[PDB]
Amino acid sequence: FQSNARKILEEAVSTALELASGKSDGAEVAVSKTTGISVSTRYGEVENVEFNSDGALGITVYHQNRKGSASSTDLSPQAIARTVQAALDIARYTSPDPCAGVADKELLAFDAPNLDLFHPAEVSPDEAIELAARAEQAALQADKRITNTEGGSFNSHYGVKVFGNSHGMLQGYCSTRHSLFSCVIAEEDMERDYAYTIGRAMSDLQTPEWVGADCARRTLSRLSPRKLSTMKAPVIFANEVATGLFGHLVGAIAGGSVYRKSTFLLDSLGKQILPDWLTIEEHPHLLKGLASTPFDSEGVRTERRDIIKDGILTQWLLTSYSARKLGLKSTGHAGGIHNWRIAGQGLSFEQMLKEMGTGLVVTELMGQGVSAITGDYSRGAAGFWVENGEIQYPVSEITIAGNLKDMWRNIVTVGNDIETRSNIQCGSVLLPEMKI
Amino acid sequence: FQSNARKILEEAVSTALELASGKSDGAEVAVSKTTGISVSTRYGEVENVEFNSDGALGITVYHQNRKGSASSTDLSPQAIARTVQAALDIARYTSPDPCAGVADKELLAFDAPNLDLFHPAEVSPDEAIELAARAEQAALQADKRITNTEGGSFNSHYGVKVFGNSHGMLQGYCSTRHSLFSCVIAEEDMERDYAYTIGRAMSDLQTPEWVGADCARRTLSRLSPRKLSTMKAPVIFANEVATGLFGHLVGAIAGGSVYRKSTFLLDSLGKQILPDWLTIEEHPHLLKGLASTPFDSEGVRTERRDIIKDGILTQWLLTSYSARKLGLKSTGHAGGIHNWRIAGQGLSFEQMLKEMGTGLVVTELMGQGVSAITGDYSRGAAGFWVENGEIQYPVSEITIAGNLKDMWRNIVTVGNDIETRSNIQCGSVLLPEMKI
């Protein structure tokens, strides 16, 4: 009957819209329901297995340009009725906003593309427990120095999403996500690290044995870290933290903070903020993409674009509201970015180390030191020290401090070792000599 | 009809139990539903107002000593049916655990005390917007140096919780929580800090004006921080971070990690881990308490106890499972601690500064450097430098490093300036001279 979840949610949406139709000028309703299994293995203990159903119905109602908003995790008929009633009532207490309303009819995806996001695992619950347990065992076995387990785990979920609005849009789609992980502790002083694999289809996942081995390799690599004196060094952001480095851009080009005049990129539109060979491509329509979407949280059509082209920032990321505040049309960004890709410059991670030849590789960062207003950047870091093109030893208690404007603009190169498990996908990046 | 939420949830619980009764040896069902309003003010902008209903039904099913577990956010009749069915099926795939089952009948609270947790706000939605806006305005007005707002906010929620199990327990209760906050940015370099107030009744909350003023005082205090060289100094944990310092104890005395032999306190039961004048009292039955509870996540009766008495650790914190693994009875700790109180030694914060006379006051900490296995402690810190019994200036980029065993045992004193907004409540604590 989960084969019927889409038709169940379509009723929830259209019932909500009907209830609201007479009492409002416009309304937007979104439902999603994500269900599936979480397995947790602790070596030499009973595994824990759960079935989780987590869902929401959001509604936004517009009356006299006054916005009500209500959301309910409970999808029963009376619960939807109360939520709708709550939005309507709230809209009686709020200040009118001529910039507020349903998304422009011409931008809605009335017929939404099939993105092939749905790949249900055919796995036994027992089979899933063995996956999780196998990953944990691979890690624990790899070295004598690994004395502890935080466990293995497996997750498989299928989501169903439906959006509708009073312009007459009703569209919905299904998706799947599976993952496998393990976490262990190694001792010499003490370190803990994890490894994982993720994908929309089971065939996209790495083996348990790969995850354990990788989990062991990482944790063992971190053992007995040294400290650096303050110095000038070039710096590599390993692909896993490099993605987050470009991730800061999202907040700085957000339409919301633009009209609020709160981003350090406010004057930068159409200007080069990054090296001239670097292009950030957005592919919201990618088949089976981790971040792929048929339409955004407002039902707006979603678009293939280079957000950055030859180093130049081409566009803001806009919703209906921030587009209207800026006198533009929404870019289909309500709810975030969909699938960023940054091409490598033709080298491996190992080739970059040889390239740099002495410097820091940052494999992990801590805290928020990153200001959207000023572009100021200060973050705790750990990683490896490199000499002669080869990693010497792990290091920690480091601070990476700069401005994102300067960091971004002066990037030396980006690698081909691509982190594929995230929304934003790129390789390691080499920064010019800085203070660390 | 939210005046009927308790009777609605009791049906959800007992229907679940009936569905499971024929297919299992024992079952435990918990429902909660929390609803209310979130207001967000951004100075010179349209406020955002929402109604949120967030809920869950958890179920644990036991068959042939095999445990199934399922949970659903959707409380509709068919959703409960599927969740129950999912637990039952999962229990066919899992390994039997003779330590697993329903809580001991003799420990369940069949007739649960009234803890007076329910104090619905009588506030207009418009009135709530004014509260949030007033807090933000108080802060923005206090000083020229405050150039930015992250906004004010107001939240008011009433929860309903019902537990039932196949031993025939069915009990439920209602609660309320209200809060008011603001966050601003001050400039000279740039800092941001927040302030808040919280309580079960509106009459427990501070005025908007108090929150704004406090928010300004904090943010302005952090401006232009200096750095210390590595040195020996005594250290105060300001009450707000002091609570978290005792909070680490919870993980170290947890029954789960005891039977796993994974805590540095494993051998410490009945032994002095803290100064002989210090007593940690647990008052789970406190009228209107922030953490008060009529019974725990297993329906077990909850108990007034000194977890630490004259510096000595008296008991583990146990659930049904970990009690059974340890050959004991549950302490009513499933789901955490309820209301910790630590008495002050008779001095104010100002008296402690005079007392110390030179040293560090830590007002905030970053990251997890705290190991439950080893008791090792390393954390980023910020705060004030103190000389002559008076704060000199703000400082940052500090690392607090020790072992919790040594830190706890050697605490010099704890203040009377009590942080009352948290589960654990105590004043500032003075640590002996350490490396910072």
Supply the CATH number for residue B3's domain: 3.30.2290.10
Of A33, A46, A126, the CB nearest to B97: A46
**Beta carbons within 8 Å of A366's beta carbon, 6+ residues apart:** A379, A380, A381, A382, B366, B367, B380
Q: Are B240 and B363 in contact (CB under 8 A)?
A: yes
Best CA proximity match to B353, nearest among B399, B387, B395, B393: B387
Q: Which residue has tokens 């706890």?
A: B408
Q: Which domain holds residue B185?
A: 1-225
Q: Can you state the angle between helices B208-221 and B125-141, rounded to 10 degrees?
A: 30
Best CA proximity match to B284, nearest among B342, B332, B246: B332
The SS3 assignment for A114 reads: coil
Of A46, A53, A78, the CB nearest to B79: A53
In one-letter notation, the amino acid at residue B5 is A
Facing residues of A164 across strands? Answer: A29, A170
Which of A2, A32, A43, A52 to mutate to test binding with chain B, by most B CBs within 10 Å of its CB? A52
Which of B92, B93, B436 to mutate to test binding with chain A, by most A CBs within 10 Å of its CB? B93
Distance, CA of A139 to CA of A219 (rounded, Å):
10
Is residue A243 located within the same domain as residue A384? yes
Distance, CA of B363 to CA of B428 (rounded, Å):
10
Is residue A208 located within the same domain as residue A254? no
Best CA proximity match to A135, nearest among A156, A122, A151, A155: A151
In chain A, the N- to C-terminal Cα span, in Å, equals: 57
Is residue A7 located within the same domain as residue A130? yes
Across the interface, whether the CB atoms of A46 and B74 are under 8 A apart is answered no
Best CA proximity match to B429, nearest among B225, B278, B291: B278
Q: Out of A184, A210, A225, pick the residue that ends a domain.
A: A225
Is residue B156 located within the same domain as residue B214? yes
Q: What is the signed CA dihedral for B268, B269, B274, B276, rounded to 10 degrees?
A: -130
Facing residues of B63 across strands? Answer: B66
Q: Are A159 and A177 in contact (CB under 8 A)?
A: yes
Tokens of A172: 């919905």
Distance, CA of B61 to CA of A119 (rounded, Å):
29
Which of A40, A76, A194, A229 to mutate to test binding with chain B, by most B CBs within 10 Å of its CB? A76
In one-letter notation, the amino acid at residue B419 is E
Is residue A214 located within the same domain as residue A294? no
Question: Nearest-CA residue of chain B relative to A72?
Answer: B53
Of A51, A69, A366, the CB nearest to B49: A69
Distance, CA of A374 to CA of B411 (rounded, Å):
41
Tokens of A433: 């000599």
Distance, CA of B33 to CA of B35 (rounded, Å):
7
Tokens of A7: 């038709």
Alpha helices in B293-348 (DSSP H): 320-325
Compute the nearest-CA separation of B46 from chain A (Å).
6
Set of chain A residues whose Cβ sits within 8 Å of the Cβ of B75: 74, 76, 79
Which of B53, B191, B194 to mutate to test binding with chain A, by most A CBs within 10 Å of its CB? B53
Residue B155, number of CB atoms within 10 A of its CB: 21
Of B51, B94, B399, the CB nearest to A90: B51
Of A74, A125, A376, the CB nearest to B75: A74
Residue B341, number of CB atoms within 10 A of its CB: 16
B4 Rama class: left (phi>0) / alpha (psi -120 to 50) / beta: alpha
Facing residues of B413 across strands? Answer: B430
How many domains does chain B fold into?
2
Compute the nearest-CA separation of B352 from chain A (Å).
30
| DSSP annotation of A33 | E
Strand B190-199, strand B232-237: pairing: unpaired
Q: In what order do the strands lie in the sheet with B429-435?
A: B390-403, B376-387, B358-366, B232-237, B429-435, B413-414
Tokens of A2: 């989960």
Of B86, B125, B376, the CB nearest to A93: B125
CA atoms within 13 A on the CB side of B269: 11
Across the interface, whether the CB atoms of A366 and B366 are under 8 A apart is answered yes
Distance, CA of A311 to CA of B404 (rounded, Å):
50
Q: In what order do the strands lie in the sheet with A429-435?
A: A390-403, A376-387, A358-366, A232-237, A429-435, A413-414
In chain B, the N- to C-terminal Cα span, in Å, equals: 57
Compute the nearest-CA separation of B51 from chain A (Å).
5
Compute the nearest-CA separation of A125 from chain B (Å).
6
Q: Are A393 and A225 in contact (CB under 8 A)?
A: yes
Across the interface, whether the CB atoms of B76 and A71 are under 8 A apart is answered no
Distance, CA of B49 to CA of B64 (rounded, Å):
50
Could you list the beta-strand ranges (E) of B101-258.
146-165, 169-187, 190-199, 232-237
Strand B358-366, strand B232-237: pairing: parallel
Q: Out of B225, B246, B277, pick the residue that ends a domain.
A: B225
Q: Are A343 and A330 in contact (CB under 8 A)?
A: no
In residues, how long is chain A?
A: 436
CA atoms within 13 A on the CB side of B209: 0
Is residue B334 located within the same domain as residue B220? no
Distance, CA of B193 to CA of A231 (rounded, Å):
32
Q: In what order do the strands lie in the sheet with A312-313?
A: A312-313, A305-309, A280-282, A340-342, A424-425
Burial of B1 (0-12, 13-18, 19+ CB in 10 A): exposed
Q: Are B19 and B81 in contact (CB under 8 A)?
A: yes
Is residue B382 located within the same domain as residue B261? yes
Distance, CA of A141 to CA of A149 (rounded, Å):
11
Tokens of B324: 């059974």
Facing residues of B217 across strands? Answer: none
Set of chain B residues whose Cβ sits within 8 Å of the Cβ of A125: 89-90, 93-94
**Beta carbons within 8 Å of A284's beta carbon, 6+ residues apart:** A291, A292, A293, A302, A303, A304, A332, A338, A339
Q: What is the signed CA dihedral for A327, A333, A339, A344, rounded to 10 degrees?
A: 30
Rg for chain A, CA atoms, rounded: 24
Set of chain A residues whose Cβ sits within 8 Å of the Cβ of B93: 49, 124-126, 129
Of B50, B52, B74, the CB nearest to A75: B74
Set of chain A residues whose Cβ sits within 8 Å of the Cβ of B127: none
Of A90, A100, A125, the CB nearest to B93: A125
**Beta carbons within 8 Å of A260's beta carbon, 6+ residues apart:** none
Across the interface, whether the CB atoms of B373 and A49 are under 8 A apart is answered no
Strand B66-72, strand A48-63: pairing: parallel
Dihedral sign from CA coordinates of B327, B328, B329, B330: negative
The SS3 assignment for A111 reads: coil
DSSP string for residues in B90-119: HTTSS---TT-SSPPGGGB-SSPPP-----
Method used for this model?
X-ray
Is residue A187 located within the same domain as residue A325? no
Tokens of A244: 């987050």
Distance, CA of A84 to CA of B324 (rounded, Å):
47
Strand A232-237, strand A358-366: pairing: parallel
Q: Out of A207, A225, A243, pick the residue that ends a domain.
A: A225
Q: Are A68 and A90 in contact (CB under 8 A)?
A: yes
With residue B382 as reference, give the H or E element that holds it: strand B376-387
Is residue A201 located within the same domain as residue A264? no
Is residue A337 located within the same domain as residue A374? yes
Give this entry's resolution in angstroms: 2.5
| Angle subtended at Cα B249 by Cα B274 and Cα B431, rounded to the nearest 5 degrees | 45
Q: Are A309 and A270 in contact (CB under 8 A)?
A: no
Set of chain A residues whose Cβ sits within 8 Å of the Cβ of B76: 74-77, 79
CA–CA distances in Å: residue A296 to residues A17, A32, A244: 18, 13, 22
Tokens of B428: 């500032």
Classify each residue of A217-255 as buried b or exposed e, where b means 16 or more C-beta atoms within 10 Å of its C-beta: ebbbbbbebeeeeeeebbbbbbbbbbbebbbbbbbbbbb
Is residue B356 located within the same domain as residue B214? no
Set of chain B residues whose Cβ sits within 8 Å of the Cβ of A33: 74
With residue A216 as reference, give the H or E element that holds it: helix A208-221
Across the interface, whether the CB atoms of B90 and A399 are under 8 A apart is answered no
Is residue A272 located within the same domain as residue A128? no
Q: Which residue has tokens 């506030």?
A: B123
Set of chain B residues whose Cβ sits within 8 Å of the Cβ of A37: 90
Strand B424-425, strand B340-342: pairing: parallel
Strand B146-165, strand B305-309: pairing: unpaired
Distance, CA of B26 to CA of A360 (rounded, Å):
57
In one-letter notation, the amino acid at residue A381 is A
CA B274 to chain centre: 22
